[PDB]
Amino acid sequence: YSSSETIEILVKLKPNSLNRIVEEFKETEEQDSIENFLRLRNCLHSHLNFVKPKGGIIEFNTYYEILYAWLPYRRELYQKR
Amino acid sequence: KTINEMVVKKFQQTIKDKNRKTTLRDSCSNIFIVIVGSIPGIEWTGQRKDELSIAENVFKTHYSIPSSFLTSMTKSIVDILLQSISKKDNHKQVDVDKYTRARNAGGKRAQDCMLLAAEGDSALSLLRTGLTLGKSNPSGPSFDFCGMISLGGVIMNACKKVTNITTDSGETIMVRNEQLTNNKVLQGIVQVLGLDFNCHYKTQEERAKLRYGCIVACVDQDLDGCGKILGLLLAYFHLFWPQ
Amino acid sequence: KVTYIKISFDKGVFSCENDGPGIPIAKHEQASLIAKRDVYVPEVASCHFLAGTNINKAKDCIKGGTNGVGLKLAMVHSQWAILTTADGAQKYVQHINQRLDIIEPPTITPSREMFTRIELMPVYQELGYAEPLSETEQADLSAWIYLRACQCAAYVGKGTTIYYNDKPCRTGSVMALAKMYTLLSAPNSTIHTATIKADAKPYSLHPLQVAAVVSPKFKKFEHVSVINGVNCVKGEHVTFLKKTINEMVVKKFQQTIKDKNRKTTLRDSCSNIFIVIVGSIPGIEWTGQRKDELSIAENVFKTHYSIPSSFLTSMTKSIVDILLQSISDKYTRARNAGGKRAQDCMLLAAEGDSALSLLRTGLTLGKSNPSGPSFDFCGMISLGGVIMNACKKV
Amino acid sequence: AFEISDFKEHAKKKSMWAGALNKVTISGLMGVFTEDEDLMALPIHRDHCPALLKIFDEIIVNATDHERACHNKTK
Amino acid sequence: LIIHGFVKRLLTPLIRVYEKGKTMPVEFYYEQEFDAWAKKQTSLANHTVKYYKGLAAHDTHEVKSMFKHFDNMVYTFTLDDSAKELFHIYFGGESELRKRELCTGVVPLTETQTQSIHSVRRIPCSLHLQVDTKAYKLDAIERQIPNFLDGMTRARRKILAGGVKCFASNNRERKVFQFGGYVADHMFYHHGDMSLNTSIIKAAQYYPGSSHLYPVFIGIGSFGSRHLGGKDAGSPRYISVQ
DNA sequence: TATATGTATGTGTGTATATATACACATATATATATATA
DNA sequence: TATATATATATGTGTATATATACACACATACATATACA
Known part of the structure; x- marks a missing residue:
């Protein structure tokens, strides 16, 4: 029953199966049993691999490295304009 | 070979497909025969006598199979052949291409559902965008009583791929062409609405046996789409079901 | 070793010559005691029924011969025949005439040659033919013998050339045999190949070579078998392949079909198959002297042999394609492709269709490029965009 | 070694006379089984010896041969 | 068969340059060779540079002059003993060999190897895999991985430059295929049209969960919508950008 | 008879490489199909 | 040999639908291959 930009999904269960879901799809403290049943989490796993000026791959470890590499180019561009 | 020759003849007779070619395996794979008696002058391929040796023409020249037996046999075999023609090649299948059914098609409120037949797939993208205004349009339609299907570009016309045969009973009949029979779009839309070619749909308990009871053509407004293919769609429904 | 088998058929006369050790040029004691005169081994081998070196066949023996009868059957249907055999020190010539009624005494000379030759004229008239053979009978018989020689050439070892009427016989592989049999029904077709091996001796000593074509225009199942050198037409080796292919075909048909209810049998599975099976099987038996049908327990193959899965998969794929099809390119051949000057030819594999337009424009400058190439030795084919790699898919 | 055989030893050693002299798979092997006053022809899915069945067959066909030979006769 | 001379290839120009007056063009086979050539010049005001994308872009006099010298320009591959390691690096199922190789650029080609290739007219497979295949893989990294300054690839940078140039006068709408023809003409795009139009479409999209949170257009x-992942857009003759 | 444990497939994203198909409209020509003649 | 069908092709300017292949890697689904046993 979804909208154009809003999600609304409706399942139907056969009777007396919620308790089997709870005892069968186990719950850790990182994800719920209902979320384990209905595929309701994912990992935000990154691969920060860019190209650099004058050609060539460069591989960063975190987004702070990308920001700190970005800043001096803009600084020098203001100086020359 | 004798049974096969008769089976092929009567199969092409009985079939109005008139093109399919069957061989001896098709003819004979449903047969169990017992043959008992004496044949003078035969020879064998060894002491075991597994295989007798003879010129085929001995039987072509001298023997005749009674025609009543041949006829009975051919009848039984062609009955099975037509049953396998109604099955096998034509067994259980699936929905049609680029088709979104409504939730209430062919049910207790079947008559109050629409088929919004569009021209391609970008139009169906527009219709999917618009039939899913969830709470921003409480007065608009949705998929509870509306469906979608594509017209495949330009409709084939049926007003010049069909022939009249005035029967000797008096009431004339209207036979389609093999090209018109095998069009995917028209086969798809007569599969969706559940139409019938030998029903005139004159009373209401035979119009209640349609899978949902109106077609709505959502076509363009340039003359290529409002004039041409809407006219050919009107011509198709005129030529086969004007009621 | 036997390095050649020369077969000839000309003006009715039929001849066959091999070059291993000859038949022993020696007196046969018991045969002479029976005949009350001097009888040598070739005379026993050619004129004494139920006589030969296979009366006591081993369970591992893969020779076709077993009965000590075949050669005398040839002699008994010969108006005249000549057995010549040499063992490296002597040559032995004996003439056997009038359907084994006149057995001339042999002539023995020194020779350093080593070979065996049977040369004979059949009794064509007594057997229903014209005397001499008509144009059609002659052509039919030559074609049939030529076929048998091609079959030998696929069955025989790799140091042995098969000649028919002095030309060598091309078909040294089951693939060659498959192509020969399907040149008309299905030219330019895909040949599924397998070497069916066993793990226990004696069977592991004798792999079966198999080539199969699968075509929608094949009307019934069909096999050609050379087993132990015999062109036999019935045997449980065929059924072994049929049943294995069928089990896989049924599995993948129910998988691929979302109908999920239809039930097909072996005739559906196999009626589009043509198979050639060539090789040796130890311990088989026959249903008569003709050796039309070999006799064996089916479990011999269930226990010992395995059909490679790649062949089964390929076959099942082709067959299931046809099944679903029944329910419901870009190659300019060169003029000299596959002939006598086939190695003088190039194949200009282009990348698309506009490239082929360029190349066909270029290879037709007939007199603006008199030193250029043309379609007499050059073909064209499309690479279809980007080639699949095999290094990640093997 | 080149050997000369007699009929007797030959027929004991060689399959050309009656078929295989051991059990092999015989395609289409059938038998008659009685199920409560009904005869049914059923497959025999077990290897058997063709020569063994042939020795029954040879006598049986000799008997039916005699029957045809005498059917238009006094005895 | 690679040992015994079975795999062969032609050798065509990639760039021809035509001098005004003279009757012989200058043919370059690699793009960086032409770039190093054309940077050396001081006045390229009367030369006509022709890029030949596929081989079906070759005119009639050019194909006549290429087919008068057909056997002059066919080459043959010779198989080395060091070639198995290079065929396992470039096309094998282990990616870390390919990461470890492809840091450094392509090794330039020496003079003895050049004269040997152009004289005895044969090619070692390893000398091919360490120039052509490696230059391709570096090019594909350039085309398919973003720059960390602007965040956009090569194609999207051409599309932004052509969009600033196109809509300068007034911000009047264009179609997708007409704007794609513009950015393939003025930004010197040397590839197909279907991929460029797909790039323009996916550069213009904006729905919850799209790639771009701040689109150019x-x-x-x-x-297209969330539901089919933005794979349910229109054809490029229907939809517009601005 | 459950258990792991090492195998094998399988879509998916952006930027590339090379292709495929249905329909409308008029009129002249065509090649095999058909009665009934007999 | 005849009079008669019904399907079949090609031209320009139009209307609509598509599909393999490369490249990396986190993730999902399918056994299956043993190893204690039982």
Whole structure:
């Protein structure tokens, strides 16, 4: 029953199966049993691999490295304009 | 070979497909025969006598199979052949291409559902965008009583791929062409609405046996789409079901 | 070793010559005691029924011969025949005439040659033919013998050339045999190949070579078998392949079909198959002297042999394609492709269709490029965009 | 070694006379089984010896041969 | 068969340059060779540089002059003993060999190897895999991985430059295929049209969960939804950008 | 008879490489199909 | 040999639908291959 930009999904269960879901799809403290049943989490796993000026791959470890590499180019561009 | 020759003849007779070619395996794979008696002058391929040796023409020249037996046999075999023609090649299948059914098609409120037949797939993208205004349009339609299907570009016309045969009973009949029979779009839309070619749909308990009871053509407004293919769609429904 | 088998058929006369050790040029004691005169081994081998070196066949023996009868059957249907055999020190010539009624005494000379030759004229008239053979009978018989020689050439070892009427016989592989049999029904077709091996001796000593074509225009199942050198037409080796292919075909048909209810049998599975099976099987038996049908327990193959899965998969794929099809390119051949000057030819594999337009424009400058190439030795084919790699898919 | 055989030893050693002299798979092997006053022809899915069945067959066909030979006769 | 001379290839120009007056063009086979050539010049005001994308872009006099010298320009591959390691690096199922190789650029080709290739007219497979295949893989990294300054690839940078140039006078709408023809003409794009139009479409999209949170363009028409992942847009003759 | 444990497939994203198909409209020509003649 | 069908092709300017292949890697689904046993 979804909208154009809003999600609304409706399942139907056969009777007396919620308790089997709870005892069968186990719950850790990182994800719920209902979320384990209905595929309701994912990992935000990154691969920060860019190209650099004058050609060539460069591989960063975190987004702070990308920001700190970005800043001096803009600084020098203001100086020359 | 004798049974096969008769089976092929009567199969092409009985079939109005008139093109399919069957061989001896098709003819004979449903047969169990017992043959008992004496044949003078035969020879064998060894002491075991597994295989007798003879010129085929001995039987072509001298023997005749009674025609009543041949006829009975051919009848039984062609009955099975037509049953396998109604099955096998034509067994259980699936929905049609680029088709979104409504939730209430062919049910207790079947008559109050629409088929919004569009021209391609970008139009169906527009219709999917618009039939899913969830709470921003409480007065608009949705998929509870509306469906979608594509017209495949330009409709084939049926007003010049069909022939009249005035029967000797008096009431004339209207036979389609093999090209018109095998069009995917028209086969798809007569599969969706559940139409019938030998029903005139004159009373209401035979119009209640349609899978949902109106077609709505959502076509363009340039003359290529409002004039041409809407006219050919009107011509198709005129030529086969004007009621 | 036997390095050649020369077969000839000309003006009715039929001849066959091999070059291993000859038949022993020696007196046969018991045969002479029976005949009350001097009888040598070739005379026993050619004129004494139920006589030969296979009366006591081993369970591992893969020779076709077993009965000590075949050669005398040839002699008994010969108006005249000549057995010549040499063992490296002597040559032995004996003439056997009038359907084994006149057995001339042999002539023995020194020779350093080593070979065996049977040369004979059949009794064509007594057997229903014209005397001499008509144009059609002659052509039919030559074609049939030529076929048998091609079959030998696929069955025989790799140091042995098969000649028919002095030309060598091309078909040294089951693939060659498959192509020969399907040149008309299905030219330019895909040949599924397998070497069916066993793990226990004696069977592991004798792999079966198999080539199969699968075509929608094949009307019934069909096999050609050379087993132990015999062109036999019935045997449980065929059924072994049929049943294995069928089990896989049924599995993948129910998988691929979302109908999920239809039930097909072996005739559906196999009626589009043509198979050639060539090789040796130890311990088989026959249903008569003709050796039309070999006799064996089916479990011999269930226990010992395995059909490679790649062949089964390929076959099942082709067959299931046809099944679903029944329910419901870009190659300019060169003029000299596959002939006598086939190695003088190039194949200009282009990348698309506009490239082929360029190349066909270029290879037709007939007199603006008199030193250029043309379609007499050059073909064209499309690479279809980007080639699949095999290094990640093997 | 080149050997000369007699009929007797030959027929004991060689399959050309009656078929295989051991059990092999015989395609289409059938038998008659009685199920409560009904005869049914059923497959025999077990290897058997063709020569063994042939020795029954040879006598049986000799008997039916005699029957045809005498059917238009006094005895 | 690679040992015994079975795999062969032609050798065609990639760039021809035509001098005014003279009757012989200058043929370059690699793009960086032409770039190093054309940077050396001081006045390229009367030369006509022709890029030949595929081989079906070759005119009639050019194909006549290429087919008068056909056997002059066919080459043959010779198999080395060091070639198995290079065929396992470039096309094997282990990616870390390919990461470890492809840091450094392509090794330039020496003079003895050049004269040997152009004289005895044969090619070692390893000398091919360490120039052509490696230059391709570096090019594909350039085309398919973003720059960390602007965040956009090569194609999207051409599309932004051509969009600033196109809509300068007034911000009047264009179609997708007409704007794609513009950015393939003025930004010197040397590839197909279907991929460029797909790039323009996916550069214009904006829905919850799209790639771009701050798109370059305003899309006008049907540009797809969350549900089919933005794979349910219109054809490029229907939809517009701005 | 459950358990792991090492095998094998399988879509998916952006930027590339090379192709495929249905329909409308008029009129002249065509090649095999058909009665009934007999 | 005849009079008669019904399907079949090609031209320009139009209307609509598509599909393999490369490249990396986190993730999902399918056994299956043993190893204690039982």
